Amino acid sequence: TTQPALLRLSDHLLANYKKGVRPVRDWRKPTTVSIDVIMYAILNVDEKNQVLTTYIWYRQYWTDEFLQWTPEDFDNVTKLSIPTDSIWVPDILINEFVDVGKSPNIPYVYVHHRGEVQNYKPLQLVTACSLDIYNFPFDVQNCSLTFTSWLHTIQDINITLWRSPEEVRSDKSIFINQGEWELLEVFPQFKEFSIDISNSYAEMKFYVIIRRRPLFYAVSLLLPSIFLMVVDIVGFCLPPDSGERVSFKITLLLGYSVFLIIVSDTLPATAIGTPLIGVYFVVCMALLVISLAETIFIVRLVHKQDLQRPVPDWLRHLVLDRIAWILCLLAVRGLLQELSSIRHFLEKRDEMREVARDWLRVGYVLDRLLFRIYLLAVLAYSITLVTLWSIWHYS
Amino acid sequence: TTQPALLRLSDHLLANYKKGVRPVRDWRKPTTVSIDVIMYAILNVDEKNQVLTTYIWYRQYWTDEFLQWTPEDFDNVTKLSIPTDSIWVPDILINEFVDVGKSPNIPYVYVHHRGEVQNYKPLQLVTACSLDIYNFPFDVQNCSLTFTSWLHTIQDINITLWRSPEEVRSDKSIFINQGEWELLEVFPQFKEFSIDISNSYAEMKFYVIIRRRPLFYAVSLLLPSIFLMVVDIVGFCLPPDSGERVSFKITLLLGYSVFLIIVSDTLPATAIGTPLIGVYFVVCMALLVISLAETIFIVRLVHKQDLQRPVPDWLRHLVLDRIAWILCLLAVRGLLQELSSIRHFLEKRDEMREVARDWLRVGYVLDRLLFRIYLLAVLAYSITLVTLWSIWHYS
Amino acid sequence: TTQPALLRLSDHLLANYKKGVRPVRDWRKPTTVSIDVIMYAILNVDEKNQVLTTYIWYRQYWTDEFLQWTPEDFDNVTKLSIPTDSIWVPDILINEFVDVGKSPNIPYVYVHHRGEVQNYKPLQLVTACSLDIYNFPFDVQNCSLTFTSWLHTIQDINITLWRSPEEVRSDKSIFINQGEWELLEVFPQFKEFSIDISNSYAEMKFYVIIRRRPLFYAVSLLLPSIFLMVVDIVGFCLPPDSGERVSFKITLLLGYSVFLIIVSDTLPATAIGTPLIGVYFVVCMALLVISLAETIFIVRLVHKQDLQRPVPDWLRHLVLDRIAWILCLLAVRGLLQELSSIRHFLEKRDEMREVARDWLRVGYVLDRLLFRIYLLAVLAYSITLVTLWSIWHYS
Amino acid sequence: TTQPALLRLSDHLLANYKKGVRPVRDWRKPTTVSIDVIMYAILNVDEKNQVLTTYIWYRQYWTDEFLQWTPEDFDNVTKLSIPTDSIWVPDILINEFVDVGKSPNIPYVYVHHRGEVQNYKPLQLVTACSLDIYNFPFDVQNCSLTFTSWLHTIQDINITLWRSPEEVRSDKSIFINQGEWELLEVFPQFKEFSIDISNSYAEMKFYVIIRRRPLFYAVSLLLPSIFLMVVDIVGFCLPPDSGERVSFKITLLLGYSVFLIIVSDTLPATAIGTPLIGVYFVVCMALLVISLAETIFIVRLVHKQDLQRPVPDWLRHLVLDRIAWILCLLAVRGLLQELSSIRHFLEKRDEMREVARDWLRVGYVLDRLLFRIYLLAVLAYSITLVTLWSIWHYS
Amino acid sequence: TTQPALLRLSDHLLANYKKGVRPVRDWRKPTTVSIDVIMYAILNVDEKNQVLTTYIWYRQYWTDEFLQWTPEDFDNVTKLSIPTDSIWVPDILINEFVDVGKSPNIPYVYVHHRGEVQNYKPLQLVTACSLDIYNFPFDVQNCSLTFTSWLHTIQDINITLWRSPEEVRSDKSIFINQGEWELLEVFPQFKEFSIDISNSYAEMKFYVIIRRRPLFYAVSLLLPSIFLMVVDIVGFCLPPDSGERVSFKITLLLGYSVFLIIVSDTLPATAIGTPLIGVYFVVCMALLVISLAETIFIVRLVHKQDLQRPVPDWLRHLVLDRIAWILCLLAVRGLLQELSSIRHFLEKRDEMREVARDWLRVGYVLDRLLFRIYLLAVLAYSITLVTLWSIWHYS
Ligand SMILES: *[C@@H]1O[C@H](CO)[C@@H](O[C@@H]2O[C@H](CO)[C@@H](O)[C@H](O)[C@H]2NC(C)=O)[C@H](O)[C@H]1NC(C)=O
Ligand SMILES: CN1[C@@H]2CCC[C@H]1C[C@@H](NC(=O)c1nn(C)c3ccccc13)C2
Missing domain, CATH: 2.70.170.10 (Neurotransmitter-gated ion-channel ligand-binding domain)
Known part of the structure; x- marks a missing residue:
């Protein structure tokens, strides 16, 4: 070799x-x-x-x-x-x-x-x-x-x-x-x-x-949903007989209805229907709809619609009670007949303004009570969400 | 070998x-x-x-x-x-x-x-x-x-x-x-x-x-369409002489018109035109347009437009009827001539307010009747949709 | 072998x-x-x-x-x-x-x-x-x-x-x-x-x-363009002195301006500029802009702006004419000086209301005439569009 | 072979x-x-x-x-x-x-x-x-x-x-x-x-x-930008004390702010910042913002805010000048004391209405002058744009 | 070979x-x-x-x-x-x-x-x-x-x-x-x-x-964020008792809330949460929300809600102080009883207008003070942003 x-x-x-x-x-x-x-x-x-x-x-x-x-x-x-x-x-x-x-x-x-x-x-x-x-x-x-x-x-x-x-x-x-x-x-x-x-x-x-x-979908989901609650909480402070409170609430509902659809494309959903995030968004919308319906109810309750007197069944049910449940407080005859008609034409306008003031007094007490109930409901929902996150986050 | x-x-x-x-x-x-x-x-x-x-x-x-x-x-x-x-x-x-x-x-x-x-x-x-x-x-x-x-x-x-x-x-x-x-x-x-x-x-x-x-297109299609009906049903409770009811209805129509277009890209349509879902959306829009036109008709009917008296042909046609069809209920002479002019200047303002109150009384009865008709129409459409889904779902 | x-x-x-x-x-x-x-x-x-x-x-x-x-x-x-x-x-x-x-x-x-x-x-x-x-x-x-x-x-x-x-x-x-x-x-x-x-x-x-x-682009183009004309035709029935008619018209113009842009991405245009569909959309916008400008003109014409009397050159030009062209129909002296001032303070308010009523009377006749002209213009455009489609469709 | x-x-x-x-x-x-x-x-x-x-x-x-x-x-x-x-x-x-x-x-x-x-x-x-x-x-x-x-x-x-x-x-x-x-x-x-x-x-x-x-980007850029100027020019004809003029102008600014962003994705920009088209859009926005601020200034100037009299320094500066610069034009004593109080309660309302009429008179002259200045500024910008295009187009 | x-x-x-x-x-x-x-x-x-x-x-x-x-x-x-x-x-x-x-x-x-x-x-x-x-x-x-x-x-x-x-x-x-x-x-x-x-x-x-x-994201991020502050600064000049100031502010907040989402897709974020740009946008929103809440507070403070007199504890706290802290300034008896009632019906309307004028006087002083505080806060934020950019830009 x-x-x-x-x-x-x-x-x-x-x-x-x-x-x-x-x-x-x-x-x-x-x-x-x-x-x-x-x-x-x-x-x-x-x-x-x-x-x-x-x-x-x-x-x-x-x-x-x-x-x-x-x-x-x-x-x-x-x-x-x-x-x-x-x-x-x-x-x-x-x-x-x-x-x-x-x-x-x-x-x-x-x-x-x-x-x-x-x-x-x-x-x-x-x-x-x-x-x-x-x-x-x-x-x-x-x-x-x-x-x-x-x-x-x-x-x-x-x-x-x-x-x-x-x-x-x-x-x-x-x-x-x-x-x-x-x-x-x-x-x-x-x-x-x-x-x-x-x-x-x-x-x-x-x-x-x-x-x-999960850090990606906590700034793209949790931030605007928690954000559009504080705009509601600020928007309750508008007085209801202004007219722009309803225009405020429906504009904010439009702004969140755009948000749900513009999120729902970049989050998939397969063979189950929805995850629990979809349930939490439906609850977030169920709070906002009753926030809208409360303003619709108060604006219906507070108006000038040639309406009758407030019911004394529900006057002492509401003014004397709700300040202690939660909140707190031959020619002379002709001239006489001419002047009595002017007095009568003014006293009916006075009465129709006092009726409107009594309904306006009922409406503000209701707008305070329902605002307290809504604020406690939002707070009780937020602490439930936090105590469900903290079970995951711990260990 | x-x-x-x-x-x-x-x-x-x-x-x-x-x-x-x-x-x-x-x-x-x-x-x-x-x-x-x-x-x-x-x-x-x-x-x-x-x-x-x-x-x-x-x-x-x-x-x-x-x-x-x-x-x-x-x-x-x-x-x-x-x-x-x-x-x-x-x-x-x-x-x-x-x-x-x-x-x-x-x-x-x-x-x-x-x-x-x-x-x-x-x-x-x-x-x-x-x-x-x-x-x-x-x-x-x-x-x-x-x-x-x-x-x-x-x-x-x-x-x-x-x-x-x-x-x-x-x-x-x-x-x-x-x-x-x-x-x-x-x-x-x-x-x-x-x-x-x-x-x-x-x-x-x-x-x-x-x-x-079909579970994918029942949360992306059926949920906002059924959802924007309850905003209409809440929005009928606004009193029509407020002015923001029309601004409510056109904002909601804008919000659904955005929705139809932002859905219609992710749902194809080939060689037929549209499926039956496109017909159901057109019916959903035909309900919302007459919901808008009813508010336009009542706002036209209820206004202060130096208008005439309500017609007695259509006063007892509407107030006495619709509470039983559906709903329910030398110097003294100079001073006299001076005072009579002031009485005449006030009584015409009084008459022009009573005419407006009678038209406002007609408008609320019509706004109740048309709300009942619209609510029964939406309910009869929803039960038809449910009984068409249940034929598919059973077996 | x-x-x-x-x-x-x-x-x-x-x-x-x-x-x-x-x-x-x-x-x-x-x-x-x-x-x-x-x-x-x-x-x-x-x-x-x-x-x-x-x-x-x-x-x-x-x-x-x-x-x-x-x-x-x-x-x-x-x-x-x-x-x-x-x-x-x-x-x-x-x-x-x-x-x-x-x-x-x-x-x-x-x-x-x-x-x-x-x-x-x-x-x-x-x-x-x-x-x-x-x-x-x-x-x-x-x-x-x-x-x-x-x-x-x-x-x-x-x-x-x-x-x-x-x-x-x-x-x-x-x-x-x-x-x-x-x-x-x-x-x-x-x-x-x-x-x-x-x-x-x-x-x-x-x-x-x-x-x-062409059946694809007849439900995605022809349906909303023909659809947003009937919302205009309904929106003319609002009385112009309400204030929400302008807010109606600009909201509808916003809703169609979104529509043009959200269509114009999925329809190409190459080496010519635009097809004839682009010309028909520009005519559809030219109808809607003059529909807006007519409401702006009537709202300017009908207001309370300490304005003068209606001109008799244009009062019998418009009320007596347009119902036949188209439409149809020592202390007593002191008290006297005190009362005459109150009569004078009321008669000027009465005169300033009658001037506003005459301008409101002119405005409604114009709002009827321009509505008839607009309705006939939309009808004459629609029949031209139909008779241009039927030349293609036949044979 | x-x-x-x-x-x-x-x-x-x-x-x-x-x-x-x-x-x-x-x-x-x-x-x-x-x-x-x-x-x-x-x-x-x-x-x-x-x-x-x-x-x-x-x-x-x-x-x-x-x-x-x-x-x-x-x-x-x-x-x-x-x-x-x-x-x-x-x-x-x-x-x-x-x-x-x-x-x-x-x-x-x-x-x-x-x-x-x-x-x-x-x-x-x-x-x-x-x-x-x-x-x-x-x-x-x-x-x-x-x-x-x-x-x-x-x-x-x-x-x-x-x-x-x-x-x-x-x-x-x-x-x-x-x-x-x-x-x-x-x-x-x-x-x-x-x-x-x-x-x-x-x-x-x-x-x-x-x-x-360049024919592609002359119907997708030049048409809506030139188009939303005529909506401004129409929207100046609203009377400023109506209230919907501000709601008009901010809606139109919203409509153009959507337009800039929905264009800016399909037009690239690399290593320079922006082309000159971006400068022309910023000038188009600088015209619209001062169009908004002019209406804000007139609406502030024309209101009922228990305001004082118009200043005679600036009354003859503005009414006598601007119509020549540009535009053109024992019981009887008791009854006496009772009536004098009613006369005094009416004359203060009369004075507070005449003050508001004088401020309303100042506001309309300013709204005409600023409209002329804005119209000439838009015209001088448009002719500059045309004479910059024609230098390119010729040869 | x-x-x-x-x-x-x-x-x-x-x-x-x-x-x-x-x-x-x-x-x-x-x-x-x-x-x-x-x-x-x-x-x-x-x-x-x-x-x-x-x-x-x-x-x-x-x-x-x-x-x-x-x-x-x-x-x-x-x-x-x-x-x-x-x-x-x-x-x-x-x-x-x-x-x-x-x-x-x-x-x-x-x-x-x-x-x-x-x-x-x-x-x-x-x-x-x-x-x-x-x-x-x-x-x-x-x-x-x-x-x-x-x-x-x-x-x-x-x-x-x-x-x-x-x-x-x-x-x-x-x-x-x-x-x-x-x-x-x-x-x-x-x-x-x-x-x-x-x-x-x-x-x-x-x-x-x-x-x-970094030149790409300085015209697509810094320009609209700095731009929508000047619309706020102009929008504070609306008088708060007009009603369209709230409709201005919520429309501008809607316009920026669309902007954040339409930017946040083309800017990535990975493994950290957000960069510092996300913090600067949250501060930009925290300025705009308190800009909204200030207008809500003034509109609540300035209204006609059958409200009581301004408190003298907080009248000389606010009018006498804030002009020196910052800003600056048998039948005759029957006729007597008939006339006294008319005087009493007018003097209560006069008093209820003077109360509203005093609250309107408080509201404008507060709207000036809060505007100064907001303007200095925006200026102090802008100079901090500039002096953080200039540390990077130098060498
Ligand atoms: C498609 O385009 C071609 C263009 O080249 C047409 O062309 C003509 O065709 C005929 C026969 O059909 C020839 O005799 C001509 O010389 C062609 N002309 C040219 C300029 O090339 C063809 O007819 C077109 N088809 C249709 C249906 O329009
Ligand atoms: C054809 N050309 C010839 C020289 C110029 C460019 C091309 C490619 C090729 N050049 C090269 O490949 C080349 N040149 N330098 C300096 C390098 C450094 C590191 C790695 C590769 C290269 C050969």
């Missing part, structure tokens, strides 16, 4: 090599690949289309008896790079695929001198999962990635793990944070899927668990 | 193999492929472009007399993996294609020892279908997938099924739910398409039938 | 075959391809980018003297499938390309025993054309598809038709309807393009003619 | 041909390619991303001494088609690339009998350029396309032109018009780029110059 | 060359590649997805002992072009990849006569980085590009620099400006990443540092 270089090893073990055969001596022995996965980024979550988009780093090794050499008589070389398109590579795919993500190809693999061939590749994957939007900003999502051979059965290709599942689960080394989703764990699980008798497939199932960071 | 391995089988039957020929001994015998399909996901439905996007799992087998071996004298091997790019593969396409979906390639096939070669592959397909939007949230869609050989005729390539059509039709095993579309059935149908005499093609036609889940 | 199979024919005529040469015996004879096209779908029309996107079915045949065999002594085979990547294929492209559409490849062709090789393929094409938007919902579009060889000249590759042009023009067999565009005809035309002397190219030019279905 | 066909020429000169070598006999002689370009379409201009997208037609030829034959003894053939993937092709790229546009490949080239090999190909290119938006609808853009070899130096590959630069510059034969951009010229320029000593590269630089057609 | 050409060199050193082996004589010696990078364009920055998109120019060289020749006896050739797909190329990738950018391939490399093979290629790269939006328009971003071999270890492939790091850092020669991001420096850094013992990888880490040009 001689020494051209140590490309004569690669000449030795790729001369008569057939990349089509499953590389075993005895065909009864399965090829056992050993995989694991580290998660790199969560690229997209489509809650409408039920489609997850991540990016992982992937590696695998297997053993073949056709890529073996003694490490002596080749100047002590124990591993080398072989191009990927010249050896047998197993078809390990994902069941949950809905599309093909673009990922760089890696043109080389390692091969040790026992036949342990190692493959390293990054791969973008676009999978489909069931996403629960029962509670939109505070939600964990449990997505599956099932690695399986698409053709070969479990007596043909078998799948194990590279390393221990306790350290696959607790691995957050290169995950890109600051990206709306916190990784929690990547839990592997082995299952043998049998489609029927005598055809069973090896599957390795990774459960990724991600939690949404 | 000897024993290198059992790659010598693959050396035996791929040495002089030609992947260009249609692999039969007698050229008069057609190659019969046997296909079936399980549906995985409905990715998109473009009602505007009439384009469906699904993702299926696909499999097929056929027989070739060039891939046969005796299972003895090869150490009892009965099947093996052969790369896909080294054997003849039929060109089974879809007639309804409009684009190419990205799908992973599967580089291996099984080959049994009789020549039964099996191919498993997933494939994303983007097809075109006719979509009826006659009833937008409650609609089934009947889409076709016609598998056919694009070149070969029925004496050259023939298409059958893998398994029975009764179990292709009732197969929902891996379909991704929670995704706006329920699968109902995938019904296969064989047809021999003859383009003319002496050129006929085999076609296998799958009819997928999907039904939209 | 013997009988392996009839793959020995494909061994016979693809052994020493060179797929690079233009396959003729005499190099002076041109290769004549024969093409035709059936239209399948109109996928997109971008009026802004001037880009058409269709999907066609395409087929072609040509003759080569290197793929010939006698049908005897091969067990009577007269045609067979040959892979596409092993024979010469002409480069027939489109001049109007701006991009590459994704289309499935067809890996096989037929070859008859005279050398007639037939190719069938579907192809998505994205071309560029000039689109006229002079009349937006009622428009035909005349788009060209010029098939030509990109390199070879007319003494090298020549292009004819498969079948007669009278039956290419009248072919609507597989076109997908219900898709905003009706196909009308696909008219072929042969032209020899000479770029200069001694370099001429064969071109086959298909003119596709498509017509838009 | 014999005559199979004239594929024996292609057998002769592609038998031992190496497509990897730069095809020259003497390695010191550079390969001179000769290129030119005709512009077909301007597909997109992203002013935000500074990215141009065009579509050109491209051609080039070069000479190689390995593709030569005598035209005799091959039956007088002087040119033939050779596939592109079998000869040496230079790497001519563009420096300004930011992406890869999709373009059809052309699989054949011509080769003459001297070695002149001609290549024709269309190519979509996506380049980056500096875009000036100093004047948005009236702007020319000067974009560069630098053709260069990406690897080879000027003693290895050299670049010249096909034809004369005077006829490359004036070539508008197949450009697609009606597409928002007029082509003006495509000016070529040769530069030898030397990165350092002893490494210089040949570059051929095409300057495309395109001009925007 | 003879002279065909100098393609016999390429015949000499690519005849028995194996492109799969790592090209060294002694396998213990690592292949040292030498890279550097010049930055060309910043294509996109997604602050939501944390994804950077740039375009660089890249070059590298390495040494191989299999591509060596003596420059004599080949007619003095010292370098030549070899196709890329025929030699060994190292796999230098980026750790921060999330996708594959489209970049043109370069089909040739240089090879010198010592084996120094040089590779030039442009490459679009889409990477992921952490982006801080703590201060949105004034922010630098520190993004990493880690070049590493994806498979080979540091005894197999090693990475150095082409040129000195001081001139890689200060290199801005071909960067495309005018594009929202200024390049500052590209700083290289070498690190040996050891994943565990006996497996270490060579990494070359480039830190690109880019700064946003």
